[PDB]
Enzyme design. Sequence first.
Site, PDB file in Angstrom:
ATOM      1  CG  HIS A 118      -0.225  -0.130   2.524  1.00 46.37           C
ATOM      2  ND1 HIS A 118       0.126  -1.360   3.042  1.00 46.37           N
ATOM      3  CD2 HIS A 118       0.239   0.793   3.400  1.00 46.37           C
ATOM      4  CE1 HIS A 118       0.778  -1.188   4.178  1.00 46.37           C
ATOM      5  NE2 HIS A 118       0.861   0.109   4.418  1.00 46.37           N
ATOM      6  CG  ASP A 136       1.762   5.125   4.592  1.00 51.13           C
ATOM      7  OD1 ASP A 136       1.306   4.034   4.997  1.00 51.13           O
ATOM      8  OD2 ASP A 136       2.976   5.415   4.645  1.00 51.13           O
ATOM      9  CG  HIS A 167       5.148   1.120   3.097  1.00 50.25           C
ATOM     10  ND1 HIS A 167       4.944   2.298   2.413  1.00 50.25           N
ATOM     11  CD2 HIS A 167       4.360   1.178   4.193  1.00 50.25           C
ATOM     12  CE1 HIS A 167       4.072   3.039   3.070  1.00 50.25           C
ATOM     13  NE2 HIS A 167       3.701   2.383   4.154  1.00 50.25           N
ATOM     14  NE  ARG A 218       2.132   6.717   8.956  1.00 50.72           N
ATOM     15  CZ  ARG A 218       1.071   6.224   8.331  1.00 50.72           C
ATOM     16  NH1 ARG A 218       0.808   4.927   8.394  1.00 50.72           N
ATOM     17  NH2 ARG A 218       0.264   7.034   7.661  1.00 50.72           N
TER      18      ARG A 218
HETATM   19  O1  LIG Z   1       5.381  -1.357  11.083  1.00 55.72           O
HETATM   20  C1  LIG Z   1       6.008  -0.969  10.110  1.00 55.72           C
HETATM   21  O2  LIG Z   1       7.193  -1.214  10.034  1.00 55.72           O
HETATM   22  C2  LIG Z   1       5.342  -0.197   9.000  1.00 55.72           C
HETATM   23  C3  LIG Z   1       3.856  -0.012   9.295  1.00 55.72           C
HETATM   24  C4  LIG Z   1       3.224   0.745   8.201  1.00 55.72           C
HETATM   25  O3  LIG Z   1       2.876   0.159   7.161  1.00 55.72           O
HETATM   26  C5  LIG Z   1       2.985   2.291   8.346  1.00 55.72           C
HETATM   27  O4  LIG Z   1       3.330   2.852   9.372  1.00 55.72           O
HETATM   28  O5  LIG Z   1       2.461   2.886   7.434  1.00 55.72           O
HETATM   29 FE   LIG Z   2       2.016   2.066   5.979  1.00 54.88          FE
END
Ligand SMILES: O=C(O)CCC(=O)C(=O)O
Ligand SMILES: [Fe+2]
Lengths: 281, 280
Positions: A98, A100, A254, A269
């Site tokens: 996906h 974000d 990712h 994040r």
């Molecule tokens: O947990 C992770 O390493 C990435 C999670 C994720 O896909 C995001 O934070 O958008």
């Molecule tokens: Fe993500």
Amino acid sequence: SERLSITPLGPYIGAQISGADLTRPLSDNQFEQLYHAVLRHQVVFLRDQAITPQQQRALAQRFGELHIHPVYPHAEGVDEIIVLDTHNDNPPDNDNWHTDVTFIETPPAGAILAAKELPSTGGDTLWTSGIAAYEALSVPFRQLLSGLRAEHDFRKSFPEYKYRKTEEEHQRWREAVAKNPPLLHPVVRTHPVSGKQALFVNEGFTTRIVDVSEKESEALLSFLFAHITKPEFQVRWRWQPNDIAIWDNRVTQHYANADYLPQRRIMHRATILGDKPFYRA
Amino acid sequence: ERLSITPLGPYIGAQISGADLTRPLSDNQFEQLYHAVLRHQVVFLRDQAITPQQQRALAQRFGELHIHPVYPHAEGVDEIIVLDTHNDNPPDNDNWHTDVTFIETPPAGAILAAKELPSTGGDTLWTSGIAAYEALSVPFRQLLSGLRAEHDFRKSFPEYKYRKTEEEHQRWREAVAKNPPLLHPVVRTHPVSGKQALFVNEGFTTRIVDVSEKESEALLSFLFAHITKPEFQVRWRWQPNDIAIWDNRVTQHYANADYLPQRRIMHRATILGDKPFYRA
Ligand SMILES: O=C(O)CCC(=O)C(=O)O
Ligand SMILES: [Fe+2]
Ligand SMILES: O=C(O)CCC(=O)C(=O)O
Ligand SMILES: [Fe+2]
């Protein structure tokens, strides 16, 4: 700040950078290059940077306005920063390709991940280049895709049946759905800066290409969703406590492995907002 | 006497009455028969008890006829192939295909006559390459127009099915040499009407060479399905003495293999075609 050590982990995407203390602000010689580092390798990795949400929210705001997630829990007193605590009670949900929040009119241009509590092993995270994958498309195909538009829906990655544990959780879903209806984004996207072309669709939210028939869409998307998992288009990162990951969300996707439960994983994040995705010859 | 032309659908197939194929057709009758075939791509005429000769005479008015080096032929008419299927020669045409597209000049059409038939079963269907193409969205039309595809003998006749005796393994190797893979337009412009049509068939087309391998697989996966859509077809339930005339230049057909152990005998005339091309 003299300069930075940028080591490409691959010819298309990937870069491990050092010599950049992320606990305290940086100059303008350092930002530029770090900025252009992420804008060059699409996704860079900086290690040993045990920083707190505010510090994370700080730098993230140096790139631009931050965005607040409609369903994911945030850290305490720090809305801007969302926390991804995963365990048996809260299974991982980012084990899919996906980009974000592409379900909003102006998807995030970047994000900064930070490892807090990691399992003994597992939880590896991948990124894939939307610009490479475009280049890998035959000319007849680029002609096809470029120009077409594809719908993005919040529900595709967040179905109602998955937010009914409580009535509160259900209410939050209903509101998030309301403020985010499905909308259109170009299949092929021109990067605001570079002007490079990239495939701008992702399995997590793209429901269909409205410019072709239903079955033509199923077939095209069925190809694109497989096409992007080609090894030469991605970089894989094995996580380590207190680690930073910044990536350009305008031309990548990712995937975060789900293979550590019943162990607990905690990620923080920051989500930098961006402009209007578009296409130009 | 004008022929009666009853369409069997808006896109393909029609049943014609008023023509006595046991005797020569007048210019006026053959012309409206010829034109009905171009218009409907496949026409059917019932109650036409003809002889191989009479059938050959009718086929010769559509073009040159093929004498088949293998298949047996009628009484003394080399141009009329006999397709005698039963338990000791099972049907092998129950797959969507366009006839012999693996040679530089695929046949322009054919005339099929039902000599003897199973009590039920044996239905043959045709799918319109014209309707299918026009049912594509503008972006798919522009994508597929101009692309070329490989047509291979080995896709319909795989090596793994010709390995039993080392004998029919070299005669296979031999066939594969007399018929190497070759190309054709993915979108064929009909030599006469100028109508555009999808010209791939899963019996022989192995891939679009103008795009990547994966892209080809996705496109063909789509096209092989898209052409099997009900709207682009016509299905025929045979009756002894039926005659079917079709334009192999812009269609595909499928013959049901669901009647064994009963016996089925058809007589066929093959009309040689010109070179397939695409012209915007
Ligand atoms: O947990 C992770 O390493 C990435 C999670 C994720 O896909 C995001 O934070 O958008
Ligand atoms: Fe993500
Ligand atoms: O048996 C039939 O009805 C048709 C067989 C066939 O595929 C052909 O004659 O090309
Ligand atoms: Fe056939």
